[PDB]
């Protein structure tokens, strides 16, 4: 009752966003603070990535525990209970769900989140991809 084409579309977008986000892998904090546009690109990419992941998690948990309500954070943790994600990765990446009237955005914290996403979300792609291959059998 689960739709691989739905998960694979969002996973394919995540990979595209990450390929773009990788252009900021070797950027300095000083150069990052002196460029408003790079902060906009980076803030927008991180939002697109986490939103796709939340959509994937929502679709998957829609079939296993249908009817149960999960927050975006607990969704990541619940994918670890079903071994779809390693519990280590589910714990490390669930705070990403927070990335999805006052302009109180700190560039220093977003700068940290670039490196976070570049290390954790490929693992999310790998682990979700393995779940999809399991579904074929």
């Amino acid at each position: 009752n689960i739709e691989p084409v739905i998960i694979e579309t969002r996973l394919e977008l995540i990979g595209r966003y990450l390929d773009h986000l990788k252009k900021f892998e070797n950027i300095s904090l000083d150069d990052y603070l002196s460029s408003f546009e790079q902060q906009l690109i980076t803030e927008e990419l991180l939002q697109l990535i986490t939103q796709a992941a939340i959509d994937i998690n929502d679709h998957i948990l829609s079939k296993l525990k249908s009817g149960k309500s999960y927050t975006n954070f607990e969704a990541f943790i619940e994918l670890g209970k079903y071994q779809i994600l390693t519990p280590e990765l589910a714990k490390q990446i669930a705070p990403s769900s927070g990335l999805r009237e006052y302009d109180d955005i700190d560039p220093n914290q977003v700068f940290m989140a670039i490196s976070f996403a570049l290390q954790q979300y490929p693992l999310y792609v790998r682990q979700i991809n393995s779940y999809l291959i399991t579904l074929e059998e």
């Binding site: 084409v5 579309t9 990450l18």
Partner: protein, 139 residues
């Protein structure tokens, strides 16, 4: 609101959205397991005349539905069927429930539905892009 209730209020949508040809509720609310997903199909001729005295009429669509349907306009997604992907059109036709038409939804279903062979061909194409990503990134 019930699917029947949404359909009754929809007759008044012609006033606020004159170029509207069909509106379909798809997504979680249509699938029977309760955001709101709405797909619209426009009259290309009528829409081009209106887009001249209102350049951003597409951005007002969610508010127009929210005011009439009494649903939170911030949680409303709009897919423009005239220029969307075949995959999105497929799921709109397969699970969507029609709310306004002017035998127009069935014509839309027959024109955009995909066979399992077509879907499995698309999903195989996407798995190739995912595996190339995983390979290029060494994970």
């Amino acid at each position: 609101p019930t699917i029947a209730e949404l359909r009754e209020l929809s007759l008044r949508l012609l006033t606020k959205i004159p170029y509207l040809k069909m509106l379909v509720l798809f997504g979680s609310r249509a699938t029977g397991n309760i955001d709101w997903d709405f797909a619209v199909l426009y009259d290309e001729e009528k829409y081009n005349l209106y887009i001249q005295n209102n350049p951003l009429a597409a951005f007002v669509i969610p508010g127009i539905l929210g005011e009439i349907f009494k649903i939170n306009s911030d949680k409303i997604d709009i897919v423009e069927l005239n220029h969307c992907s075949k995959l999105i059109a497929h799921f709109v036709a397969r699970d969507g429930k029609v709310l306004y038409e002017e035998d127009e939804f069935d014509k839309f279903q027959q024109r955009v539905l995909l066979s399992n062979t077509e879907i499995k061909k698309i999903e195989k194409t996407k798995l190739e892009n995912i595996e190339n990503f995983l390979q290029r990134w060494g994970v």
